[PDB]
Design a protein around this nucleic acid. Structure first.
Lengths: 163, 122, 175
RNA sequence: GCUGAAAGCAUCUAAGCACGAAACUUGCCCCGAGAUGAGUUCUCCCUGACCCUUUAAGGGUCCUGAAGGAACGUUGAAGAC
RNA sequence: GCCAGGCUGUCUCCACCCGAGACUCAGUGAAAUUGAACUCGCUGUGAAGAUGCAGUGUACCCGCGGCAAGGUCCCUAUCUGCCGUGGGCGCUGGAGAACUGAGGGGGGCUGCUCCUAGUACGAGA
RNA sequence: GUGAAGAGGGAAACAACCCAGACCGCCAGCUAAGGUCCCAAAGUCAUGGUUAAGUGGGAAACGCGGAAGAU
């Protein structure tokens, strides 16, 4: 409700198209599409994006707020992108990266390899530091969570992969 | 080989003369025991100060089998009777430093590296 | 690589240089002629129907004679199926040698065990039944020796069937 | 568990939205189209004549007897039969 | 009346063989019972565990071989159910072969050592 | 009151539960209890409300819970 009443400013270089309930956003990073719930109406609102709950839906306000938050995140991603940093605390924890696969060794007898979804770039300024760049917050977050799940932050030394 | 209530000979200077099997280990609800298997035996006759007294319960291993045992090359080395040497759960090193009769070459196990030295007759 | 049908001949132990003689069963695998190809378009699935051996002129029924003539293969004493590995089909009239098993090291042997007489109630149910002459596949058998110029296969262990019994050897899919 | 409020905090879920226990099923192999829902593929054989009726999933007569099977013998590592 | 010892498949585990039955061939051939039987499972009720009453599922018809759930430790294993294998029949002119497969069946156990490693963690243990 | 000595319909079956006392017959119609999605004959019928859990299609005392029922 309160969050919904907040049009999000779209900077230059970002194109927004409202095809019925579908929202298609384009920017420097690349294409993005997202089918929006029918309980909220979204208009172009040049330089902004106004959300209005549809009459007859009790959950309209929360749906509109969530849609506004998602559209704002997508706009911020396409315009500049999203960056995440992960540290590996512990002796012998390597974060070798090659191609579209991240290889890690966190005390397991076998390497743990995670596939990188398309549009996600992995870099290693330091061997123990891994940085992910992606246009969509969801994809980068999911890959980071998958990497973190391999070795949970150990609650006696705080080892493993941490944000 | 061994079965229930088997009669085993003695191949050590521990003083045992007649040893009789009571239980079979090396597998739950196991039927028989082999040469390279641990068996449960007790003593029936002992010298005046034999290391084993009647009713004793301690492990043992068969060194010679009346039924005979096989080899990868088809050898079926067999002996006139069943010979067994007593072992203890702790301090596996048997008291007897002398073994009667020859021994086969299957005693190369981790714990049987100290018995191959004995038994000069092969 | 693909299943081949052969005939059991005997079993022995092949004495190795290190005195580790291994039980080997002997299969004679003549060059099996692919009689027909079963494809998705016609037969609904990928496979090959193959034969082997020779049939007496009187033993070959005219329908079978025409089937072999269409297949362009010598009339073999039996016909069998072999599911393909979704790699590629074979051509009609193609003879398959034993080189395919020369680089497998793991095969499964399917065959009919030696028949046994009347298996009474105690032997079957512990009504009466029977044992043997049942097509069963023993898995995880490694080929010991392969001789293509002699069509000889030695497989570890034992396989169902007596001397002269027909059997099949397939890639060891299960491990 | 990535962003995340409604309810300026928080939360496994309300929107976007991910892994995962030997627990269950395929996957391992055997029988299996009497599966009457009676299934799919390959091959082979028959290419005659006449008469009658209640004139049609009709009947009868002469010739023909294809492939296959069974009939019998040798019999089997097939079987009580 | 008791003890010690040797002594055999009584057993772990039973495996094969020898003679009569058990099965077929040609002939003899009686029985207890019998109201008649086109004699299925499960759920529910019933003078109270239903082959026969209400609901539901499966099953082509008929034979050959028996385990027996139905101190004479009695009462043809007659008949229900039970697996294997056969005779007849249809898959639509007939026949010989190779099979997909709706479904059903079997089992899915577990100890030790070796590298990781005397490693992460852990003040140390 | 019923059975005993009353058939028949309904309650899925059922003798004591509801309706209902069979002279015989005719391929007609109207009712009693019970039903009007079907099996199985009838409204997938009109209006005012409860029901989000298959409670209906089994359950007390007690603060919607209590609630666990027969191959």
């Amino acid at each position: 409700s309160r969050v919904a009443k907040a049009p999000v400013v779209v900077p230059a270089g970002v194109d927004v198209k409202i095809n019925g309930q579908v929202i298609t956003i384009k920017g420097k990073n690349g294409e993005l599409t997202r089918t929006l719930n029918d309980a909220v109406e979204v208009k172009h609102a040049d330089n902004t994006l106004t959300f209005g709950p549809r009459d007859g839906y009790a959950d309209g306000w929360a749906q509109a707020g969530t849609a506004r938050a998602l559209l704002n995140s997508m706009v911020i991603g396409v315009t500049e992108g999203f960056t995440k940093k992960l540290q590996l605390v512990g002796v012998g924890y390597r974060a070798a990266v090659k191609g579209n696969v991240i290889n890690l060794s966190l005390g397991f007898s076998h390497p743990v390899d995670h596939q990188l979804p398309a549009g996600i770039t992995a870099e290693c300024p330091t061997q123990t530091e891994i940085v992910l760049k992606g246009a969509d917050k969801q994809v980068i977050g999911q890959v980071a969570a998958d990497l973190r799940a391999y070795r949970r932050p150990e609650p006696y030394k705080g080892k493993g992969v941490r944000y | 080989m061994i079965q229930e209530q088997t009669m085993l000979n003695v191949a050590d200077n521990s003083g045992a003369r007649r040893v009789m099997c009571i239980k079979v280990l090396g597998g739950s609800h196991r039927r028989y025991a082999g040469v390279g298997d641990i068996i449960k035996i007790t003593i029936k006759e002992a010298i005046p100060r034999g290391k084993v007294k009647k009713g004793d319960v301690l492990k043992a291993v068969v060194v010679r089998t009346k039924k005979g045992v096989r080899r990868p090359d088809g050898s079926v080395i067999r002996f006139d009777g069943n010979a067994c040497v007593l072992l203890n759960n702790n301090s596996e090193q048997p008291i007897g430093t002398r073994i009667f009769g020859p021994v086969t070459r299957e005693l190369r196990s981790e714990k049987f590296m100290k018995i191959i030295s004995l038994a000069p007759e092969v | 690589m693909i299943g081949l049908v052969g005939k059991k001949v005997g079993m022995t132990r092949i004495f190795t240089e290190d005195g580790v003689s291994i039980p080997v069963t002997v299969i004679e695998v003549e060059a099996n002629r692919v009689t027909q190809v079963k494809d998705l378009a016609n037969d609904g699935y990928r496979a090959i129907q193959v034969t082997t051996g020779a049939k007496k002129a009187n033993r070959v029924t005219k329908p079978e004679a025409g089937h072999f003539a269409k297949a362009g293969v010598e009339a073999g004493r039996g016909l069998w199926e072999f599911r393909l590995a979704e790699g590629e089909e074979f051509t009609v009239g193609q003879s398959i040698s034993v080189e395919l098993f020369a680089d497998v090291k793991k095969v499964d042997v399917t065959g009919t065990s030696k028949g046994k007489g009347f298996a009474g109630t105690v032997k079957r149910w512990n009504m009466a039944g029977q044992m043997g002459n049942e097509r069963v596949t023993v898995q995880s058998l490694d080929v010991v020796r392969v001789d293509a110029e002699r069509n000889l296969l030695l497989v570890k262990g034992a396989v169902p069937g007596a001397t002269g019994s027909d059997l099949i050897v397939k890639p060891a899919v299960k491990a």
